[PDB]
Amino acid sequence: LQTFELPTEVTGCAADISLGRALIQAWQKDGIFQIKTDSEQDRKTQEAMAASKQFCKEPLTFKSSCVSDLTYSGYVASGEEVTAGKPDFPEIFTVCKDLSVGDQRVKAGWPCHGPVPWPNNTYQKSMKTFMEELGLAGERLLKLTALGFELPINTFTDLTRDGWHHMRVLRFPPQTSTLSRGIGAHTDYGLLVIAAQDDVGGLYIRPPVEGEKRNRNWLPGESSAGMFEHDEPWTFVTPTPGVWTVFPGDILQFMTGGQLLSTPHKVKLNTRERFACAYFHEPNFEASAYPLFEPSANERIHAGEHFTNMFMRCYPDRITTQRINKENRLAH
Numbered sequence: 105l106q107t108f109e110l111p112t113e114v115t116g117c118a119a120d121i122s123l124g125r126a127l128i129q130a131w132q133k134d135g136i137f138q139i140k141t142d143s144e145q146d147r148k149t150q151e152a153m154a155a156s157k158q159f160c161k162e163p164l165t166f167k168s169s170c171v172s173d174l175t176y177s178g179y180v181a182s183g184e185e186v187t188a189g190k191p192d193f194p195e196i197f198t199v200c201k202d203l204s205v206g207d208q209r210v211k212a213g214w215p216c217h218g219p220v221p222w223p224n225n226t227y228q229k230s231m232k233t234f235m236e237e238l239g240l241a242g243e244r245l246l247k248l249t250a251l252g253f254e255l256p257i258n259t260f261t262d263l264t265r266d267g268w269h270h271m272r273v274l275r276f277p278p279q280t281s282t283l284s285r286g287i288g289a290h291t292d293y294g295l296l297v298i299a300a301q302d303d304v305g306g307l308y309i310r311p312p313v314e315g316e317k318r319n320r321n322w323l324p325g326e327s328s329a330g331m332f333e334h335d336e337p338w339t340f341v342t343p344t345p346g347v348w349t350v351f352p353g354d355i356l357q358f359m360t361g362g363q364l365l366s367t368p369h370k371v372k373l374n375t376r377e378r379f380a381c382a383y384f385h386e387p388n389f390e391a392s393a394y395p396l397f398e399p400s401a402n403e404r405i406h407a408g409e410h411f412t413n414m415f416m417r418c419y420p421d422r423i424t425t426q427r428i429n430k431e432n433r434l435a436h
């Protein structure tokens with residue numbers, strides 16, 4: 105895979121435009137590239153992964169208490185069945201925008217808005233500072249992408265102001281310990297996905313395949329789930345120190361008219377447990393994404409509406425979903 109070092113500030117100089125061209129080319133050929141982490145980005149990744157490992161060592165009663173009826177942030181034990189001798193399962197802690205009940209959007213009952221049920225304040229601090237760095241990387245990447253497409257440098261800036269960025273903090277069990285098979289082929293609904301992983305290995309991505317029609321996962325009727333899972337090609341994302349991976353999400357596919365494709369990906373379970381984090385760089389919850397290259401187009405996709413429906417469908421029995429239904433929160 106290509107690995108690039110990003111500049112700290114993207115200003116629009118010739119080097120920035122050149123880098124944007126190269127990022128687009130790498131996505132168009134490989135579906136993914138790596139970005140070099142600096143010493144602080146790396147340190148903060150390691151501290152977040154350590155906090156994740158410590159949290160997963162807590163008893164299940166405690167982990168299961170890290171839930172909220174206002175936000176989807178918090179813990180889920182994935183799956184619905186276990187057996188004797190296969191008692192383990194994937195675990196996710198989702199971090200969405202951390203808004204207290206003092207925030208006006210929370211007071212107004214906006215769906216998905218509320219405070220993260222942090223397990224402790226060291227996990228909180230570790231995840232917040234990691235997500236701050238991930239957000240800055242996302243902004244650099246979007247400015248470079250704009251420059252590479254000959255668009256204004258700040259094309260994405262209003263769209264992502266106070267963006268609804270969120271992250272899944274993941275633990276996958278060893279294959280022999282679980283009835284889970286990992287995560288099947290899917291795409292992520294976001295502008296960009298920035299991901300980190302430990303040394304165990306398990307992530308596979310599907311590059312662009314010339315002539316291969318792709319479902320447009322921003323449309324409810326074109327779910328990408330499961331598609332191509334058993335068909336070649338799948339690229340193994342070899343664990344590599346000192347990098348994050350980056351691929352386009354569904355929103356960038358929409359905005360670019362398919363010049364970038366949302367990268368399908370899947371996770372296979374290994375012989376050891378595996379830790380990873382997947383960060384989703386997003387528009388503002390209230391913003392609508394639009395075609396960048398079709399100025400006459402009136403079609404839009406509303407980020408907040410899609411986020412809410414996706415979480416409601418993925419976690420239909422969570423207290424968060426029950427409260428959305430009880431209070432008819434979709435009406436906001």
Ligand SMILES: O=C(O)CCC(=O)C(=O)O
Pocket residue numbers: 272274292299300301307369371380381382
């Ligand atoms: O486990 C990984 O490396 C990626 C996980 C993922 O794709 C997700 O949480 O959407």
Ligand SMILES: [Mn+2]
Pocket residue numbers: 290291292369382
């Ligand atoms: Mn994913």
